[PDB]
Amino acid sequence: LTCDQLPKAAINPIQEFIDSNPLEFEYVLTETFECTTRIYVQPARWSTTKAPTALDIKGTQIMAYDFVGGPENSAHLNECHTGDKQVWYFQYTNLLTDNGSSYCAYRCNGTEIIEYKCASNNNGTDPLQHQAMEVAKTVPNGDKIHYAKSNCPETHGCFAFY
Amino acid sequence: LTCDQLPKAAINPIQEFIDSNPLEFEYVLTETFECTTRIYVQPARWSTTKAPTALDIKGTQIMAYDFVGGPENSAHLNECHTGDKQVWYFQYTNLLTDNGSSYCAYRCNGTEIIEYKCASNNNGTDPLQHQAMEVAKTVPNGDKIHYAKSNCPETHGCFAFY
Ligand SMILES: *[C@@H]1O[C@H](CO)[C@@H](O)[C@H](O)[C@H]1NC(C)=O
Ligand SMILES: *[C@@H]1O[C@H](CO)[C@@H](O)[C@H](O)[C@H]1NC(C)=O
Ligand SMILES: *[C@@H]1O[C@H](CO)[C@@H](O)[C@H](O)[C@H]1NC(C)=O
Ligand SMILES: *[C@@H]1O[C@H](CO)[C@@H](O)[C@H](O)[C@H]1NC(C)=O
Known about the structure:
The structure is a homodimer. By secondary structure, chain A is mainly β. Chain A has one domain (about 1-160). In chain A, about 10% of the residues lie in helices and about 40% in strands. The first copy, chain A, has two helices and nine strands; from the N terminus they run H-E-E-E-E-E-E-E-E-H-E. In chain A, strands 1-2-3-4-5-6-7-8 form an eight-stranded antiparallel β-barrel. The interface between A and B is large, with 42 and 42 residues. It is classed as lyase. Keywords: Hydroxynitrile lyase, lipocalin fold, four disulfide bonds, dimer, lyase.
């Protein structure tokens, strides 16, 4: 199996993601998105693209990306500080269940995987999530995929921020 | 007029704030919240306080505060990185109108004002907002209140983030 052959799952309407806030990552590829919270935001009233935004928040640092739909269930992200483009797909989503929400998303470079983000608001207890992670690790460079919360900083009274 | 005598307006239910996302500050007191976007987040499924969170996002930096209600329409904030406490009130709110949402909030130390945050998603066009700012500037230390967006960094394709 190669990264281009992974499933490209249907994307839930944006409000379903917003209603899942806040999420934390359970499995990631590089160190970048360890100990990170995901927040979805609807488009600004003054946005001329009317693209929603994904926020990746790691302590007191934040990466924001406006995103729009592309072909074959892709998300086309524009990183808001640089204007750099990223193309993402979902292996699966399972939002707004009786046990909360999860999904696994990935970014390829051709046949290899270069980033991975499995998110949930149920502490990774959706059996689909572990299952998806085990499939993603089988594509080239998927050996890097690892648990995202092994050594996160101590909290100071909040639950999704530190 | 002193800061303790400013109005302490009714607080809209949290979902009305969430539905106003994203907001930007129009008037602030210190330099801290210049060029800053406000995002409200519902409590995490795993939060034992079930407090919502306010996010103040300034470029790639973020301050998060879980907050709960206190006496006399106060918001009691817990800054998520330090555990430091802040007590806030609203001069007014005007959320989810046909021209969007605005509010002005403040933080006193006794008779003086120490921080001010007027937010909107309509570029400060709610006449209540300019009016509230003109009242707040009359309390001790209100002379510091100023326009929040005079010199913000260039955007790179997004609208509420940079
Ligand atoms: C994929 O890798 C190649 C080789 O380094 C690079 O030129 C390209 O920009 C990368 N990203 C893609 C195709 O999104
Ligand atoms: C979340 O899952 C991790 C890993 O299994 C575990 O160590 C932790 O106790 C869980 N947290 C809760 C609140 O159940
Ligand atoms: C108000 O100012 C006094 C004097 O510096 C300080 O001790 C106190 O902690 C400040 N903050 C309050 C009352 O919230
Ligand atoms: C927002 O208001 C400022 C100050 O009046 C103005 O310079 C700017 O052009 C306004 N933006 C829009 C999109 O109307």
